[PDB]
Design an enzyme around this catalytic site. Structure first.
Site, PDB file in Angstrom:
ATOM      1  N   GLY A  76      60.370  84.547  42.568  1.00 29.47           N
ATOM      2  CA  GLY A  76      60.538  84.842  41.154  1.00 29.47           C
ATOM      3  C   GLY A  76      61.956  85.236  40.786  1.00 29.47           C
ATOM      4  N   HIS A 118      63.348  76.909  46.245  1.00 27.48           N
ATOM      5  CA  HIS A 118      62.937  76.639  44.871  1.00 27.48           C
ATOM      6  C   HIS A 118      63.900  77.234  43.860  1.00 27.48           C
ATOM      7  CE1 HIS A 118      60.482  77.456  41.157  1.00 27.48           C
ATOM      8  NE2 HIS A 118      60.282  76.147  41.299  1.00 27.48           N
ATOM      9  N   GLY A 167      63.699  87.233  42.591  1.00 29.50           N
ATOM     10  CA  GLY A 167      64.228  87.695  43.865  1.00 29.50           C
ATOM     11  C   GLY A 167      65.709  87.478  44.124  1.00 29.50           C
ATOM     12  N   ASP A 226      58.926  72.025  41.377  1.00 32.24           N
ATOM     13  CA  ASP A 226      57.677  72.763  41.267  1.00 32.24           C
ATOM     14  C   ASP A 226      56.632  72.278  42.268  1.00 32.24           C
ATOM     15  OD1 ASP A 226      57.872  73.325  37.632  1.00 32.24           O
ATOM     16  OD2 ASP A 226      58.844  74.362  39.301  1.00 32.24           O
TER      17      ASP A 226
END
Length: 122
Positions: free
Chosen positions: A29, A47, A31, A89
């Protein structure tokens, strides 16, 4: 967009995306930094590198076109941003699923002050 991302996560992993993955380890997220904790944290790292590369596309807001037909996620948009955001995604959601066998519940809401160690170049 993030809800499309969320759905993909669900289908692959069967866990709730926000409560499983939003606060996981060092790189999920929001992070910021620190050495990745496990395969899942790493899935989350790659990602971020995926999304930053598409910064101009606004990957968190950008709705695309995908379907889960016959076991696979197929990214059906023609234009580059939507074409590639979907790919990111998917790339993560399948990454999570194949790394479930080490999903560690004590990293679920990990206290990130313990994520110390110099940052990781994307």
């Amino acid at each position: 967009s993030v809800i499309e991302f969320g759905k993909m996560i669900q289908e692959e992993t069967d866990k709730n995306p926000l409560t499983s993955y939003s606060f996981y380890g060092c790189h999920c997220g929001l992070g910021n930094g620190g050495k990745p904790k496990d395969a899942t944290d790493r899935c989350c790292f790659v990602h971020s590198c995926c999304y930053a590369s598409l910064s101009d596309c606004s990957p968190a807001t950008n709705r695309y076109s995908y379907h889960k037909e016959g076991g696979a996620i197929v990214c059906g948009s023609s234009t580059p941003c939507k074409g590639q955001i979907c790919e990111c995604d998917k790339a993560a959601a399948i990454c999570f699923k194949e790394n479930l066998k080490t999903y560690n519940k004590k990293y679920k809401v990990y206290l990130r002050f313990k994520c110390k160690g110099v940052s990781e170049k994307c």
